[PDB]
């Protein structure tokens, strides 16, 4: 029914625009890059264009396009994200930082011409000014984890949950627990999946020629967790 997956057979330019406010510290982030869902591969560069990010870059990675996941052939009928294209979807999260504040995010991800645009509003509340987040105590390290997706038939979309560890300068870890929901923007058909997960690896780096507050991201996202069918033939 949807043919949105056809939009992702090659390299697709990506634009990200975030407007944020954490504890009243307001900021903007813009990013550009491209994604190649054939390989689940994303390459992006972000700048905090208001000048100075008031939270650590690693806390914004997950908020700053799972439509670029590589869904293996045997599980293509479980890719909600591309099915919603080009009209797109709303992705909303609440992200809890253990013993600290939370982010609430709302984004729309959709095509604008041939560009895949993720536009986000982020509100963070109840942070400690001397905590690991407003205090910039997190290391600028790789992030990896599994995003566990389930259908949400009532909303014609999906939910997901996951937990990530952020390494603190002092050696400990800062947990960031994510709750997610996605719903289509359009009224057309979408694919509602069986339970599965996205295996995501994000590598964070710096452009050695870039003096502005920024992040270079190289990421791989691969779907998994649907069986191949040996148990679906009979006994």
UniProtKB/Swiss-Prot annotation:
Changing residue 200 to Y: Gives rise to yellow-emission variants. In EYFP; leads to yellow fluorescence, folds faster and more efficiently at 37 degrees Celsius and has superior solubility and brightness. InterPro entries: GFP, GFP-related, Green_fluorescent_prot. Changing residue 65 to L: In EYFP; leads to yellow fluorescence, folds faster and more efficiently at 37 degrees Celsius and has superior solubility and brightness. Pfam families: GFP. Keywords: Chromophore, Luminescence, Photoprotein. GO terms for biological process: bioluminescence; generation of precursor metabolites and energy. The keyword Ribosomal protein does not apply. Green fluorescent protein has been engineered to produce a vast number of variously colored mutants, fusion proteins, and biosensors. Further generation of mutants led to more stable proteins (at 37 degrees Celsius for example) with brighter fluorescence and longer fluorescence lifetimes. Contains a chromophore consisting of modified amino acid residues. Maturation of the chromophore requires nothing other than molecular oxygen. Changing residue 195 to I: In mut2.1; shifts fluorescence lifetime from 3.03 to 2.50 ns. Changing residue 66 to M: In Citrinine; leads to excitation and emission peaks of 516 and 529 nm, respectively. Photocytes. Changing residue 172 to G: In GFPA; leads to enhanced fluorescence at 37 degrees Celsius. In Venus; leads to yellow fluorescence, improved maturation and reduced environmental sensitivity. Changing residue 221 to R: In Azurite; shifts the excitation and emission spectra to shorter wavelengths and increases quantum yields compared to BFP. Changing residue 199 to F: In H9; increases fluorescence at 395 nm excitation. Belongs to the GFP family. Energy-transfer acceptor. Its role is to transduce the blue chemiluminescence of the protein aequorin into green fluorescent light by energy transfer. Fluoresces in vivo upon receiving energy from the Ca(2+)-activated photoprotein aequorin. Monomer. This is Green fluorescent protein. It comes from Aequorea victoria. The gene is GFP.
């Amino acid at each position: 029914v949807s043919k949105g997956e056809e939009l992702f057979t090659g390299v697709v330019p990506i634009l990200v625009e975030l407007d944020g406010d954490v504890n009243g510290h307001k900021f903007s982030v813009s990013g550009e890059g491209e994604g190649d869902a054939t390989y689940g591969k994303l390459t992006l560069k972000f700048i905090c264009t208001t000048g100075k990010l008031p939270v650590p870059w690693p806390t914004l990675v997950t908020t700053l396009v799972q439509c670029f996941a590589r869904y293996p052939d045997h599980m293509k009928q479980h890719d909600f994200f591309k099915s919603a294209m080009p009209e797109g979807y709303v992705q909303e999260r609440t992200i809890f930082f253990k013993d600290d504040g939370n982010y609430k995010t709302r984004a729309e991800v959709k095509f604008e011409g041939d560009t895949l645009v993720n536009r986000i509003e982020l509100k963070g509340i109840d942070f400690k000014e001397d905590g690991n987040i407003l205090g910039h105590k997190l290391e600028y390290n790789a992030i990896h984890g599994n995003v566990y997706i389930t259908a949400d038939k009532q909303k014609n979309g999906i939910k997901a949950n996951f937990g990530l560890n952020c390494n603190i300068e002092d050696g400990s870890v800062q947990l960031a627990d994510h709750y997610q929901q996605n719903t289509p923007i359009g009224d057309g058909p979408v694919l509602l999946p069986d339970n599965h997960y996205l295996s995501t690896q994000s590598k964070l780096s710096k452009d050695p020629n870039e003096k502005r507050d920024h992040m270079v991201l190289l990421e791989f996202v691969t779907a998994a967790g649907i069986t191949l069918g040996m148990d679906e033939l009979y006994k």
